Design a protein around this ligand. Structure first.
Ligand SMILES: *[C@@H]1O[C@H](CO)[C@@H](O)[C@H](O)[C@H]1NC(C)=O
Ligand SMILES: *[C@@H]1O[C@H](CO)[C@@H](O)[C@H](O)[C@H]1NC(C)=O
Ligand SMILES: *[C@@H]1O[C@H](CO)[C@@H](O)[C@H](O)[C@H]1NC(C)=O
Ligand SMILES: *[C@@H]1O[C@H](CO)[C@@H](O)[C@H](O)[C@H]1NC(C)=O
Lengths: 236, 236
């Protein structure tokens, strides 16, 4: 029963948005991590923007899982060749706070990343990191995660797009009936990515959630992520 | 390996588009069925617009099913209260021609509508008809069809939106890996519809297809459907 539209971020914004970590607005943009005055991205930073109004994912009683659609556009301002880590759209309990930086995208802690029982987060990640010592695919990719840093579904994200210097459009939908989460990543280039997989929102998250977007940086300082717009709609 | 963008239909259009049945352009719009000079919709009409370039759905040899995304906006110009039948996005062999009008949306013939073996068409229908003598749901709805007029997945389409008098956005994606077809129907009102289900493009259609949109009318003359824009992207 929640829907919102942010054509950009020049409005006040802090009514409807909750900023965690480095998260802040920057020129009608949503900037998740912080940068120098010389515009260089700070190391090991995490940031998340959450919509201030909770969403009914499921209802114990009247029993069924909500369906929702979300859309947002972003830009990967990349300088060097070690872009990391990226961003993610996610759902979490209303009181969730930012987590670890690095490949955790401020969604997971270093120690319990793989233990589903100790987590409250379902997300769609857009990863540009390439750390082999981390649970794979091991290459830059788009993935769906359910209370774990090891994705149930992954789709490779070609560098030609990642470093395109173009605005990408992310479309995430969830059919709370067929319980299928779909992710479509579009580039004006025409190139698109479609990723779909089963997710049980009832078994992994509480009845009420907060929807948000987060980013994090690691060692390198070659990446800055900007969210230019974000729309959302849910129905239970 | 095919992608196109029609922000509207004021360009020449007939290079890239193939008009079948009543299909024709009308004021930067795609008008599938014909109307009076008094603008009244003609009875029992069918029309389909097909993209002139074939799409590789699957490849026998190098074996895998393509993934694709499609988007289009439309308007339901409804006068009376018997809007019928609606429109559909679909895939068919390159040489497919328009079929029966009525609840067949120019995609099926009256006699073999339910016999999957005698059909070559996978589609997403947006039905406004309410004929109880027809294979149900029996109420106005959005549905996914695979070589049959009886949908594998259906989602109810509330009248408040159907008769909204607003522009609707249809988003259809297919993950040729997880083999999941998703449909998101959006209204500026915020109201959205998410429908996902399994579809085997390899078993129901030939290697090469034509993507298109079609509409049809029955007895009533209370409906005219317009497609304002249509973008598409496929990758095998
Ligand atoms: C956002 O950044 C500005 C500087 O551009 C600062 O003045 C403000 O306090 C910050 N607000 C939040 C919520 O981080
Ligand atoms: C998780 O990481 C955050 C941020 O570093 C920290 O404040 C919190 O205490 C950590 N929680 C656990 C269980 O490690
Ligand atoms: C389309 O309709 C116009 C009238 O508006 C007509 O002149 C033209 O021949 C038609 N073309 C096709 C392909 O139907
Ligand atoms: C299907 O319907 C079309 C349009 O009415 C017709 O031309 C065609 O011959 C029909 N085919 C069959 C097998 O009935």
């Amino acid at each position: 029963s929640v829907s919102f539209t942010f054509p950009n971020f020049w409005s006040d914004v802090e009514d409807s948005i909750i900023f965690q970590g480095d998260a802040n607005t920057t020129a009608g943009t949503l900037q998740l991590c912080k940068t120098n005055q010389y515009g260089t991205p700070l190391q090991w930073s995490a940031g998340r923007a959450l919509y201030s109004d909770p969403v009914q994912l499921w209802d114990n009683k009247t029993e069924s899982v909500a369906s929702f659609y979300t859309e947002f556009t972003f830009f990967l301002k990349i300088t060097g060749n070690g872009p990391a880590d990226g961003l993610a759209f996610f759902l979490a309990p209303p009181d969730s706070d930012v987590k670890d930086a690095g490949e955790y995208l401020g969604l997971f802690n270093k120690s319990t990343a793989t233990q589903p029982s100790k987590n409250q987060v379902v997300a769609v990640e857009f990863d540009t990191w390439t750390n082999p010592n981390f649970p794979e695919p091991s290459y830059r990719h788009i993935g769906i995660n359910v209370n774990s840093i090891v994705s149930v579904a992954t789709k490779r994200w070609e560098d030609s797009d990642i470093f395109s210097g173009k605005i990408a459009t992310a479309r995430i939908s969830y059919d709370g009936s067929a319980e299928i989460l779909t992710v479509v990543l579009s580039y004006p280039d025409g190139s698109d990515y479609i990723l779909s997989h089963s997710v049980d929102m009832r078994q992994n998250l509480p009845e009420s959630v907060r929807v948000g977007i987060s980013a994090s940086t690691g060692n390198n300082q070659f990446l800055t992520v900007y969210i230019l717009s974000w729309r959302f709609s849910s129905n239970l």
